[PDB]
Amino acid sequence: GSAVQVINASEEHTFVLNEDALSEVLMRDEVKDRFVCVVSVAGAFRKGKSFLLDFFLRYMYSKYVHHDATERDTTGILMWSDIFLHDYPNGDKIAIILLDTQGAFDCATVFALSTMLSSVQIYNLSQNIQEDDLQHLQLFTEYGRLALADTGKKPFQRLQFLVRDWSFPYEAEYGALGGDKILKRRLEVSDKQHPELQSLRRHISSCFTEVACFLMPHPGLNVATNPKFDGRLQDITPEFKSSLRSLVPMLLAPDNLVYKEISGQRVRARDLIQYFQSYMNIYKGNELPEPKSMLVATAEANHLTAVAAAKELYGQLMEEVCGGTRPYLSTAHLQTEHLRVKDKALFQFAAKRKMGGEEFTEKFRKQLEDDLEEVFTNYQA
Ligand SMILES: Nc1nc2c(ncn2[C@@H]2O[C@H](COP(=O)(O)OP(=O)(O)O)[C@@H](O)[C@H]2O)c(=O)[nH]1
Ligand SMILES: [Mg+2]
């Protein structure tokens, strides 16, 4: 059809990455600018995830495109082949990504990826915001708390508690007005004497730019209880549809378009392909052990990305000004000219600022020099 959803990982029995696959799309000339949205939905299998998404399209394909008319046996996460570009004026230039968790679910421990990798997380919850649901949000409030000391800047931007089939609008009215009555409660109250480490209601704010909750009307017994739905639009309750119209926009079009911001700085799309394979290593270990750091893995991709960011620059400053149509023959101070570009590759490397440590970071520029300086010791003399 018009577009497909590409797998990124599998599971049974290992936990492969489809490196090419992810790469075979992000690298399209949406190589940029600003990965960003990066909107994801996750949570309870068949609490209607891959459906809220399916309206994210049949209602986005038409504010970015035609402005009027017109995981079967594997987990991992989805990406739609289509991607939604923008913008100007003071932008950006922004690609738009949709991920839809799925597959081996029986929240099935692949909500961290789909959150580590996301500028807008939609925790797709049912009935109520329970405590168990609140307990899956631990391994970030610590991971980030470190980072809070470390980077100094809150990782994670927006988490959207989405309550599907909320059923007492008389206490709290459907939508954002009541999303933030219910939420505010359940992060007061049982912060008072009741649970132990889930008392991370105290740390949450710090680790997210925006945390907000939304309450959905039950759609209807006919959608809820039917195998392979289509019917018609009437077949859905008006209360649902009226909510979408407040929902989907609320999230989409800028500035509800949320900038993916590692360290404290936006990121292009060509760098996701890094962050994707980086985390994914220390997930089920790549060997055995987890988690909390995490901060090892984020920094180590926070960093190796600037290397490849300031190595592309090297060539694309050297073999043009210092080579190519006037090639590889002595001057004898192309060296002097190469020092310049090497310097540029370091003087303009320290873009300010990534993160990871001190002896941990500069470890890399040690290997920029020794990987930059390996053209001075070249090529065929
Ligand atoms: N109760 C309820 N059911 C829904 C809602 N939205 C979709 N469904 C039903 O959920 C099923 C599909 O869920 P789906 O998104 O594919 O599974 P998931 O991706 O794993 O969450 C179908 O029966 C839909 O009728 C909702 O808001 N409430
Ligand atoms: Mg699904």
Author numbering: 3 to 72, 92 to 127, 135 to 409
Copy out sentences from the published article reporting this entry, exactly as the authors wrote them.
The merging of ER membranes, i.e. homotypic fusion, is required for ER network formation and mediated by a dynamin-like membrane bound GTPase family known as atlastins (ATLs). Moreover, purified drosophila ATL has been reconstituted into proteoliposomes, and signals of lipid mixing in the presence of magnesium and GTP provide direct evidence for membrane fusion mediated by ATL. ATL-mediated fusion has been shown to require GTP-dependent dimerization between ATL molecules in apposing membranes, and GTP hydrolysis drives conformational changes in ATL.
Residues 1–422 were expressed in E. coli, purified, and crystallized in the presence of GDP. Similar to human ATL1, the structure of Drosophila cytATL revealed a GTPase domain and a 3HB connected by a linker region. The two 3HBs dock to their own GTPase domains and point in opposite directions. This configuration is very similar to form 2, or the “pre-fusion” state, of human ATL1. In addition, when average B-factors were calculated for the GTPase domain and the 3HB in our structure (37.84 for GTPase and 60.59 for 3HB), the results suggested that the 3HB exhibited significantly higher flexibility. These results suggest that the 3HB of ATL may adopt more than one conformation upon GDP binding. The active site of Drosophila ATL is mostly very similar to that of human ATL1, where conserved residues from four signature motifs engage the nucleotide in the presence of magnesium ion.
